[PDB]
């Protein structure tokens, strides 16, 4: 029985995790008090992927909430699903990182990491057969970036054979909210490229574009962005929980998506998205889902796939549908867009089908692409990084916490080498 | 327990403190006598926010503030006023003469025998605190006490506490109007301490505030009460992030991390956008874009300096009220496309953003309208050098002939100290001129090896 | 310069003499011929290498190569290059149970020692005779292993942890907190080597009774000091000798591994696959930019896929003079493995290198400008102007 | 789990009188359908030997397939499907889809058909 431990770090991670647990609890018919009030008998068949059982026939999520500022924790407890989490897993301190990666990684987080690892060990030792971990955090911040990277390193040291997922919100070109995002993003990526099996890139610019352009919302808040992200998280691990005509575990996705170890940065997507008023016009079927799947404007990372090539893609469908139609549509997508796929991987589309859709939909699907266009995003950060490291714009805050220019230089070099590795396969020719 | 200790020094400090504590008492539902009926009526709550007020067993709320002065007058006005029962009786007022517009009198001669009591009471307040965040020091350049005693206090605090942040709000002398003939000497003397021992210094100018009051609020004849109320609104906007919930909270450390590139450049300007009268509150939308644009207008700056003559090195926007992130992003994008607002090339990001849900409050008898949205901008820029250079000129015009110098030497200084301070000032000015320069063309001169 | 390539064929072990004992390796001069045991009609494919050693027949004089012969061919030349002021490397290669450990280390209690013993012997000798009032020498030793993509120190065993790998902007990758020790005599380096060999992880498998479980790197930092009154270059040369003993590729069926042994074999095979990929590419790119024409657009060599290739970035290419010693088994049953080694060895012949002598850059510029002044002065004086 | 599988097969075979053969259903392109089939066929050939062993396997289709790494899994199964099996029947998903579309007039067939 495959079971996942969930870790949340920082404000963004905590809020996305809260929305994600709301969505998952709705999917399995879990009351906010913890009781089960579902209808289908297949909701409880695999409840133990995310939830532990408790004596009063209750269910407690296997979640670990982490921060250095207490306030966010309070916002989780005083909420619709605050009481569902067990209070022993709320790990926090005082004197938050203050948007400083050094404080989160070296000075402050070094004290709380022991407690967080203790709770992680306690949750993992009770697992029947642990599958992997998944961490939600923001790269452009303080405690999120630093302590997420530290926890990832420690866990990979302790559990090398397990899967390490990661849902990261990374800085956008236009939408900037802190002045020192490039430093934190560069160091975080330097850690992640080493110590992670899969990393799903998420960008606020792309999510705002989806909300404005596709969903036609006029006032999108952070709740809607958390909604989209949580839908993606559920779509990724659907196949562990429900039966289907063609299953797809996390390891299957990892094997079929990662050709070489360092290229595991994925562009996520979801379909359908109908804007609450155009759904009465669009007929729902596999071709429409596929058409919205590969559309440029639907991607969540703000990187145009038409500027590169798809090393690999994976599509996980949910709903009763024919496999012939799915295979034909993926094959058509490959042949028609013959210039956006590499020529040294025959059939570089992975397919999975699950029988049970979401609660309110007859059909749904999720998209995990792996393309060279992601290099663009890294290049952007690198540019900004140079513009602040040539003059040492804010370096004293980081060097006061016990860092040196050596770490900055090596992180920049690692990011540039990653960019070059992606750029190797971008241009055409190569062949056979 | 995001706790802050406020220190008010001198007449300007005490009066700004009166305004600040009126605002804080009204925000939290505290009465002038220290009781909070809201908890009694409701039955309990978190309204006794520990940032400013400490709760005793009986339900009284004592502020975390320290008033200091050498004149009994300014604080005897407080001991017998409306708020006589709010403050702890210990108010640290030397029953002697005043510094007499003399840095030496307040630093060397009379600043002693009052400093020990002040640090003892500050120690008592800091021992009551858990997770102390920093100090907020209110004082005035150009005065004797507010310069010299603030210098001594800051030095001793930096010796004792060390790592805690020390923010400073101060009234810089104006270009034209002045209230003393020996302002430049005191300002140039205290710059040597505020440069080393502070972490971030916010400067305000009375000519700018008078102009804002005349133009925006349509007040023809303002007094110091209006200026103190505006400064109180600004400090409340700064400190709101650690008292109420919000979409994005910005603590006091994020301030210093984002607004201070180098240790010697910690002199940002401050502005408040929706400064408007009740009558003109109508006929206006007061959207996010309007207030964000108004923050960048040179006329609304609180120090008589033109940002168009310099370059922006960092900006921090703190929003209050019915504000959502997408409008903030749109406003920042609109500002980034204007050619009159120039950013240094070595700071591509530029902006820090914080949002708080609590809207600003209205003080009865005030002059600011009730609004749904507000923003306080803090901008670290290079135009501030101009505001210093004028003062330097004034200093020279008096020091060539050694006018008013014997008063300073008679109180325990020597002449060379003056020169030392002036030299330091030049160095600081030079640093600004070196950091606003564009990076040399293709910073690695040029390049392009083989392939 | 090019990578030097030596191959060495070994005798039978107990496993091979118990089973079929037909040889497939034949050799002559500097040419090695493999013969397919399954296809006697096929051509006897042959490969040309810079050196080829035959240790199959102990008493015969038919091109028999003892330990000393290999040393005088490879290690003596590499130590000469080390005295010339060049960083040098010798690294072993092949499959499990072929001779890497024997060739690099050998058996201490015998007249049959490895390259590292004789190299340090000859170095200690040469510094001893050439010592003078003005000339002096200093040498330091270090020894690390890569077990499970984790670097461990051998000399100091009490460390008990995985050190951290860093990247100097100018000097490239290195290992932080590596216990480099100063030594003064051959007894000292002998004691260090014995402690290190005792510290290494070794386990018994069906293919080898003492199969190595970790890559190993032995580093000697050597410094020559030439101090005189005039301006004589002080601490002129600083060379690094890197002697690398890699673990060999394994097959689970023949090895019989289970549990920890199988995971160790998997990590070893991952590292060796990454090394082979890096070797193939350094090769093609060089050969191309070398034969192709000279565009030099962009070629990406995946150094970062493993820690082994990361630490040896400068030795496999760039700033070092490197030699590859491949081990070969004679048994027919191992044919499909042995050929593979030979194939990669052939590709190792194509790789090039760019090594230069070390010095302080300020002193480099000063010396170069002084030489230019001297040349211009001589030219002017010869022509009647100076 | 291979030992448990062989124990159950032995228990079934002991009950059987005049056992004629095995019918092994698996799929090229999957991890288990290749690796486990190889293990099981090897052990069955070692144990039983003279009993017939038929295979009904699903070969990868020329165009459509549901995994990127199918060719590796299909090629690595060659030794076991060549040496140990006696007669292997191979079927393709595309051909059966075409048969369903043309003969049975099923526009959108699924794996049940
Ligand atoms: C007629 C009807 O039922 O209305 C739909 C609907 O109108 C649309 C527009 C829904 C609707 O979603 C939105 O309006 C929306 C707004 C901001 C961000 C994201 C969504 C819907 O709200 C969302 C809601 O979706 C669900 O319930 C899914 O199961 C979803 N779960 C939740 O949204 C959820 C909400 C609160 C608490 C717990 C879960 C889900 C999706 C994927 C994986 C797991 C769960 C549905 C069916 C609808 C409404 C109600 C209007 C959509 O919802 C999704 C993401 O599945 C948006 O586009 C789809 C397609 C639908 O047509
Ligand atoms: N904005 C504002 N400025 C003030 C206020 N009170 C005094 N000032 C300024 O403070 C300057 C004089 O310094 P003071 O603060 O009076 O110095 P002090 O506290 O009296 O100390 P002593 O000179 O020793 O008595 C004047 O130039 C005023 O402009 C006030 O209430 N509001
Ligand atoms: N040229 C040679 N002459 C004589 N004996 C040799 C020769 N080469 C190897 N041997 C012996 O043959 C065996 C295999 O050599 P060995 O050095 O153990 O291979 P290895 O690759 O280092 N072991 P492993 O760690 O599993 O790769 C040892 O017993 C050696 O002493
Ligand atoms: N999608 C989403 N992004 C968020 C949310 N809150 C903050 N962010 C992003 O996170 C960044 C700030 O990082 P932060 O969470 O403060 O890092 P931390 O201080 O370590 O927790 C900003 O760039 C925001 O865009 C949220 O609720 N949803
Ligand atoms: Mg006074
Ligand atoms: Mg060995």
Residue numbers in the entry:
A (entry chain B): 1 to 432
B (entry chain E): 1 to 451
C (entry chain K): 4 to 389
D (entry chain A): 114 to 226
Question: What do the paper's sentences say?
Answer:
KIF1A, a key member of the kinesin-3 family, is recognized for its high processivity and fast MT plus-end-directed motility. These attributes are crucial for the long-distance transport of cargoes in neurons. Mutations in the microtubule-associated motor protein KIF1A lead to severe neurological conditions known as KIF1A-associated neurological disorders (KAND).
In the presence of AMP-PNP (abbreviated as ANP in our maps and model names), we observed classes where KIF1A’s two motor domains are connected by its coiled-coil dimerization domain and engaged with the core of two adjacent tubulin heterodimers along an MT protofilament. Both heads contain AMP-PNP bound in their nucleotide-binding sites. In this configuration, the neck-linker of the trailing head is docked onto the motor domain, while the neck-linker of the leading head remains undocked and oriented backward. However, distinct differences are evident in the KIF1A structure: the backward-oriented neck-linker of the leading head deviates more from the motor domain, taking a more direct, linear path between the two motor domains. Within the two-heads-bound structure of KIF1A, this proline marks the start of an α-helix that pairs with a partner α-helix to form the coiled-coil dimerization domain. Densities associated with the C-terminal tail of α-tubulin were only evident in the AMP-PNP state.
